Amino acid sequence: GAQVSTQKTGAHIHYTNINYYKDAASNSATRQDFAQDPGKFTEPVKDIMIKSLPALN
Amino acid sequence: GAQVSTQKTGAHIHYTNINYYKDAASNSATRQDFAQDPGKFTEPVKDIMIKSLPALN
Amino acid sequence: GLPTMNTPGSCQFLTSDDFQSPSAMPQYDVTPEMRIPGEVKNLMEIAEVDSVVPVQNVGEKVNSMEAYQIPVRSNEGSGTQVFGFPLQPGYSSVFSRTLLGEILNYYTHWSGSIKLTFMFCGSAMATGKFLLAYSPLGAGAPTKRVDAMLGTHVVWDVGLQSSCVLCIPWISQTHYRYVASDECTAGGFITCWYQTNIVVPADAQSSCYIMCFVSACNDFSVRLLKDTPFISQENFF
Amino acid sequence: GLPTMNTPGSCQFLTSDDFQSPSAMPQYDVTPEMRIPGEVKNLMEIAEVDSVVPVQNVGEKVNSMEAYQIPVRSNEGSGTQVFGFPLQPGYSSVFSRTLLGEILNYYTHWSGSIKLTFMFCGSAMATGKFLLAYSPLGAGAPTKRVDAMLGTHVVWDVGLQSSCVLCIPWISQTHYRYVASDECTAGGFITCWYQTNIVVPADAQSSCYIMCFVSACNDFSVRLLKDTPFISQENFF
Amino acid sequence: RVADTVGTGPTNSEAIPALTAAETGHTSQVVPGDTMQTRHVKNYHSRSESTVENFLCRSACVYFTEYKNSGSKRYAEWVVTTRQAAQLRRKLEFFTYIRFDLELTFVITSTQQPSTTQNQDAQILTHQIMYVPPGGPVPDKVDSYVWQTSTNPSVFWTEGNAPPRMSIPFLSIGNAYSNFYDGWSDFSRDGVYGINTLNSMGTLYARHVNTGGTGPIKSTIRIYFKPKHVKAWIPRPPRLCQYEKAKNVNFQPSGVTTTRQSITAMT
Amino acid sequence: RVADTVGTGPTNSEAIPALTAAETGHTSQVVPGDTMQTRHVKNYHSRSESTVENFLCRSACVYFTEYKNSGSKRYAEWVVTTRQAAQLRRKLEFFTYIRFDLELTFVITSTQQPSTTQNQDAQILTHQIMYVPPGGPVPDKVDSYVWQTSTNPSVFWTEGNAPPRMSIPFLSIGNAYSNFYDGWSDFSRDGVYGINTLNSMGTLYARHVNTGGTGPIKSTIRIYFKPKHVKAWIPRPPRLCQYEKAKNVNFQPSGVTTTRQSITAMT
Amino acid sequence: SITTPEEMIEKAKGETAYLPCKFTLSPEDQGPLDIEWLISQVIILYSGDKIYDDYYPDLKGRVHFTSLKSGDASINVTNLQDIGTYQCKVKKAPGVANKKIHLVV
Amino acid sequence: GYSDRVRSITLGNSTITTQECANVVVGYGVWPDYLKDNEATAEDQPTQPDVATCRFYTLDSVQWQKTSPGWWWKLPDALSNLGLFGQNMQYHYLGRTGYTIHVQCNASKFHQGCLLVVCVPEAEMGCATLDNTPSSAELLGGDAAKEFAGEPIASGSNKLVQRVVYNAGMGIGVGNLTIFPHQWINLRTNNSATIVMPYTNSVPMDNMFRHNNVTLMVIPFVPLDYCPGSTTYVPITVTIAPMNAEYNGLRLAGH
Amino acid sequence: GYSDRVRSITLGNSTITTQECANVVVGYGVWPDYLKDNEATAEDQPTQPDVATCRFYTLDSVQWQKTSPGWWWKLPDALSNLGLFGQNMQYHYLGRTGYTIHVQCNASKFHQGCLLVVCVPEAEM
């Protein structure tokens, strides 16, 4: 029951991971999580402000 | 997810490689790369010079 | 048994390795996660957020709220420089303790643009025009408005809208600049001048202030984590 | 746990092993590669490129540009030897500091042909005929042109084309010769003679010079990497 | 992967991207092409090492204590808390709430203390690291019944072996460790105020299983914490002033920023 | 695999393969059959060990420093640079630009220094190797807060274990390490000139985690660099003269080549 | 790091001799700046952002920094008599560089 | 009919014609081209004059005496003060450009000699004293010969660059230099040599004032020899033409 | 929403922003363009920097006193010594270029005045 994922390589490869301990708190660090959403902190305004349009009409 | 490649043997065999670390900068040395092109340094002239034909006509 | 040989590097401890290790307490039922407003998944999202820049870090003013305000006033002249600082988000003191700069001090290599947002906090009647200008590395910092006119510049005008952003472009030979000072990767010079004069009507103040913010554009990247040089410790607390 | 026994050779360090090792800094975003003119993938491509051979390495001349020039002149005679050197691209001083020879000094076993390219750098009116000749190992180095006439030879004639190549064949009992000196694998003798005389018209120089280049043919191979004996060091710099 | 720039030519229009209103609290999303001319550059750079997980996954010592094999301090007792150190503490503070698993690693080092006892031929030292969960019995002497180990998780490590490493799952009654707590434990609002009131993660005890030899030996144990599977909520400004205490956020007022020569100076 | 020879018989034609023009800069591509008669020999030889990767993949010590456990030099500080050594430096120089990953291996060796303290029964030594990235805080004493390790990559190795080996990914702001730099850091062209100006790879710090024992012990740490995943550009002639300095290419004028007896001598 | 580390400055007796020790710092260098001047023994010291006369009898009150951490550590020795090798050792924890100046007349 | 010797190169508004010439050497096999977007790193819109800068510039002629050891020109520094190529170099911060080197030296049939026209990337050179590096104006020359010296340069408390011809100032065998794109000027057959050099730097663009990527070295391996009665002053004139100039980071002029 | 007053002009590497502005006057109705081949007379390949020269140059400010009669700038002469536009003008013989004039003068609500910003072709004086 081996999980195969791509290795972090340069720009312009696979590695095999098998979970030995059944606790699941012993799993290796989940580094490969490149997900972001700046809307929560940047641009938190209730009404959308198109950058091209004037801000305060 | 094991990669199987031929071993370096004599002239006139397989080995199994599994990438453990996910970083991909920890991979073993890529020795088996026998590719060459002498044109860049040897014979760098813009116009082809056929060896059999006279060089400076 | 399976015949194995231990390669060099075995039985060692590395501060930067991800591996598995038996849990001290097995089958612990962790407390289920909930929804907390504002989860952060990447440090760069925080860098994108605005942060006030203490441009007037002169003398004792770093010990007061006067550090952030940049002073402007109606003077009988034009082309007088308003401020100026090097583009070193990591090393320059102007940027060092800003949210972008302090997070950058936790890394070694940086690349991308910067959104310097200048907010005019003057009176409602004051009308001042300013030449925000960034000079690319290579020559001495501009000493006159005409010298700065050549390099990338935005003629900010004050109206109903207050703030104007000077988006500093990523001009550099190297794909990444060093967060610390280096002659090889000098970021450049950022300066402001008076395009005209901040004229005000009577019975109104002639000494307005301007605040400056810093942020990273959507093309900002960092690499090579290192411990920050700002924190210090003598013994455990 | 999986029952294993450590075979002999475990927990040792080998300077010539390829294995895996945890990265000190994980998930480092390397700087993307670009196109740089002239990527090299094999050392032998560099060996194929021409390199001037200091044939006249006599006395103090190794301390001047006179080391490369080989002197020829119109003398009242024929069969006079012009130069001569053993075929030891690794050990012979003539070849040792040439690009082919110096790269060869980083290896132990060599095999293949050699393109000795002789460029006549004399006047435009000078006409000289030369018997480039390589003698296979076994007998003493030829002392007269008639002795050399027997072994492999090319009667180079000077015209509009200047350079002529003497492609030294790979004659040897062993598939590979030792880069260092050895009685068992003596490479052979390479020599040049005057087929006629370098005749020149009046008001023109009678003392021409000849330069020699060395290169490896497309059937050249090396094996058994070793550290070079030319570099030296006392303490770290 | 980071977003790239898009080409732009000369422009002349009513629309203004630069002029904005920072009063709204929306950081302008202005790309470089908005205020100049820019070429189409494909940026292959990746924000991979700036991830929260990669940011805080480095092993970092939190506390080192030293226990001798013979004398007053036979065993070492340290309450678990990441606030004792500075670098890891500051790293974690960036987020008001944080939920991470732990991978404790212990680096133990012995030292023959200067003495006068002769024929000092000590045998290999053996050490025991015991985690007492909060409310559990705590050892008073180096040889009490508590050291025998009933249910508490303890690791026995002989010296010269690879350093012991036991992973810890998330251990908090709440739904996330609170880095900052603006509250009192007492409803009356009288008593301790701060992070210490809500964060109790147990106590750590380290002792010599065997005395080791005739001569006194002092054993230094260093505890390393590496957050893993980290999820962080509510980012906060980094601690500007130097830490003064472990149980509280008390600080000494410090200059917003290091000063420079003048407002136009470039140093 | 190397190319083989092709058979040839006697020839008599206008075409001349030998006579050429070396002025053009094209090395003649003349096979042995062109100037003689040759048989068809299948050459099974392979240019496998001459590959750039195989050429520079050998582990090679770059610098060894020695730090005592008690005295003036408690810790060792070496700036990372392949120029300190000679063999590996010369190997790398062959290429004007080079892009390689690193696999640092540390060979640490201890030694009981002569002294007069009696009852020297030292416990097993423990060592720490810390890599400070450029711009990072650097330790001043053997026990400063920097040694605790916040985010810098450090390895803890107890003596008698297999030597520590941590791989390093390519670390350069540019697109390739520049072996030669014909430029100044300062636009004015006044200041340091050379490879040192553009190559900063951080600093390496080695210290004794535990003093070890009563008697003084001196620890020699040897650092080995093995380029891997190497790509090289623009081959250059090998350094003929002996190196004199680490930060510059300065040399002492040396004879093109070792002399021989005469122009016809065979020794 | 220091510009032109080996230097031979010859100057006539009676006028101030300018001895440059301009230095450039690497990114790896983040340490307290210790600048020490030696003659052939310690003329001046710079530690903790202060300048030390060091009670040198031959050169007391005649030696001062011309400029500082900016990168200049030059000295204008006044009223020469002093002939010797002046060594300037700017100090950083990763690398410490020294410059030797031979002074004549 | 056809003839290999004759060749005509036209660039910008100035073209050159060589009756006897050897085949052009195209660098490492890569003809210079503008910076592709797959590898760009400067977001500014680059200015490309493409005629104003891409034209044949003729530098100062130098005499080839029978005692002349050699000469070296830092290509970027050489054109720093000539025309718009110099002006735009002074203004812009970043600068990327390919080169079309062409060295002319014509002599009668009765003269003899041989030059090595080779362009060396990253010609980092060594000072006479080992501890210090050479100063600008000693290492660099503006439209200046910067001649090599056969005698080893005396090593004292100075910043004189080693001009030792048998080392080329880089402490390497001068004969082994051939690895770099090179064309020989053997007086007997070819009076001209042309090398088209691609932009060879590790970074996409670099400041030309900050660093000189390539340096044209002319080293006479065989000395000029002539019988009495022939012309005794045969010069070597170098015409370097930039190609595909691309500049970013407009700032105030200077350096 | 929309507003006629606000306007932002970007050219080269320098852009300008005017909160209150009147509609741009596009010359005689012909936006400047490169020399078409139907009417060219110089056979040389023209150099077109298009960023190096096409950028906003800010000249020297002048005071508007209550006694100031007027001012005149010869556009080609004004930029003769500023940047590459000046350098390329000094080098090349022939020169064709369109212009994007922009005059700024901001005053509070309590000031009063009126300028005539007009570009005159062939101002023979």
From Swiss-Prot, chain G:
Notes concerning its domains: The Ig-like C2-type 1 domain mediates homodimerization and interaction with JAML.
Disulfide bonds: C21-C88
Role summary: Component of the epithelial apical junction complex that may function as a homophilic cell adhesion molecule and is essential for tight junction integrity. Also involved in transepithelial migration of leukocytes through adhesive interactions with JAML a transmembrane protein of the plasma membrane of leukocytes. The interaction between both receptors also mediates the activation of gamma-delta T-cells, a subpopulation of T-cells residing in epithelia and involved in tissue homeostasis and repair. (Microbial infection) Acts as a receptor for adenovirus type C.
Post-translational modification: N-glycosylated.
Subunit record text: Monomer. May form homodimer. Interacts with LNX, MAGI1, DLG4, PRKCABP, TJP1 and CTNNB1. Interacts with MPDZ; recruits MPDZ to intercellular contact sites. Interacts with JAML (homodimeric form). Secreted isoform 3, isoform 4 and isoform 5 can interact with the extracellular domain of the receptor.
Tissue expression pattern: Expressed in pancreas, brain, heart, small intestine, testis, prostate and at a lower level in liver and lung. Isoform 5 is ubiquitously expressed. Isoform 3 is expressed in heart, lung and pancreas. In skeletal muscle, isoform 1 is found at the neuromuscular junction and isoform 2 is found in blood vessels. In cardiac muscle, isoform 1 and isoform 2 are found at intercalated disks. In heart expressed in subendothelial layers of the vessel wall but not in the luminal endothelial surface. Expression is elevated in hearts with dilated cardiomyopathy.
Designated name of the protein: Coxsackievirus and adenovirus receptor
Sequence ranges assigned to domain Ig-like C2-type in this UniProt record: 1-102
Lineage top rank: taxon: Eukaryota
UniProt-annotated glycosylation sites, renumbered to this chain: N76
